[PDB]
Ligand SMILES: O=C1[C@@H](NS(=O)(=O)c2ccc3cc(Cl)ccc3c2)CCN1c1ccc([C@@H]2CCCN2)cc1F
Ligand SMILES: [Ca+2]
């Protein structure tokens with residue numbers, strides 16, 4: 001197991017292997033955090049989150 | 053839903069219910085965004101006219117969070133046929149936007165490649181709805197959810213009396229008495245990944261409900277991701 005096969009490449013959501021390197025991205029309504037791994041909700045009620 | 057558990061407060065906020073002229077739920081749906089609902093194409097033949105209810109967990113009371121929405125555009129997949137239930141997918145554009153709140157939120161649409169390698173290789177997914185609690189019975193008045201194992205594709209083809217196309221997958225149990233059932237059609241099959249729920253299927257069909265040697269058959273959402281995208285852009 002390597003890159004995206006290794007624990008989702010440490011990404012919160014989507015993991016791609018561009019070149020021989022991990023590239024993380026997020027679903028609509030999330031912005032990729034400064035660390036390029038975590039997904040941060042842009043506003044209230046982001047998709048896929050149970051409420052309260 | 054046969055077996056499973058009640059969706060507790062805020063647990064299944066992407067659930068939509070298609071209601072007919074007499075305010076009765078006949079199918080489920082998944083909230084994709086403020087204007088769009090995902091459902092099964094075969095649900096569109098079960099009612100002359102219908103509306104979409106969101107934020108509902110108990111059909112017997114007013115929990116204060118419910119909201120009825122009229123449909124503006126029904127986008128049925130053209131290749132859908134009653135013969136095989138292949139392409140069992142439809143998208144609904146609403147007249148007015150959904151207001152997200154407690155019990156009302158969209159499920160995420162994943163990317164295909166990642167969804168197929170990482171979501172559909174998870175052990176289980178979660179199916180939900182107001183459908184029957186037993187093969188013979190009335191619709192549930194409470195919203196229910198059920199954890200359903202992904203089923204090996206080969207095993208599923210073997211168990212099925214009907215053709216399992218590439219736009220379908222199987223989930224549930226061989227003998228354990230848990231499954232989706234009548235009225236659950238069109239509803240959410242979602243898969244959890246690090247506390248984020250992604251839409252992975254649409255409740256499609258089954259040879260009865262929770263029968264031994266049979267599984268739940270779901271539309272493979274990953275096969276229609278581009279189509280869903282095109283459908284939402286207009
Ligand atoms: O869906 C059902 C059953 N109806 S149900 O309301 O009990 C039902 C509906 C949806 C389900 C979805 C899941 Cl995931 C599990 C059980 C389900 C049971 C009765 C027979 N049946 C059913 C059986 C076979 C087919 C195939 C595909 C097209 C034609 N041959 C289609 C069917 F609709
Ligand atoms: Ca209610």
Ligand SMILES: [Mg+2]
Nearest residue numbers: 225226263266
């Ligand atoms: Mg079974």
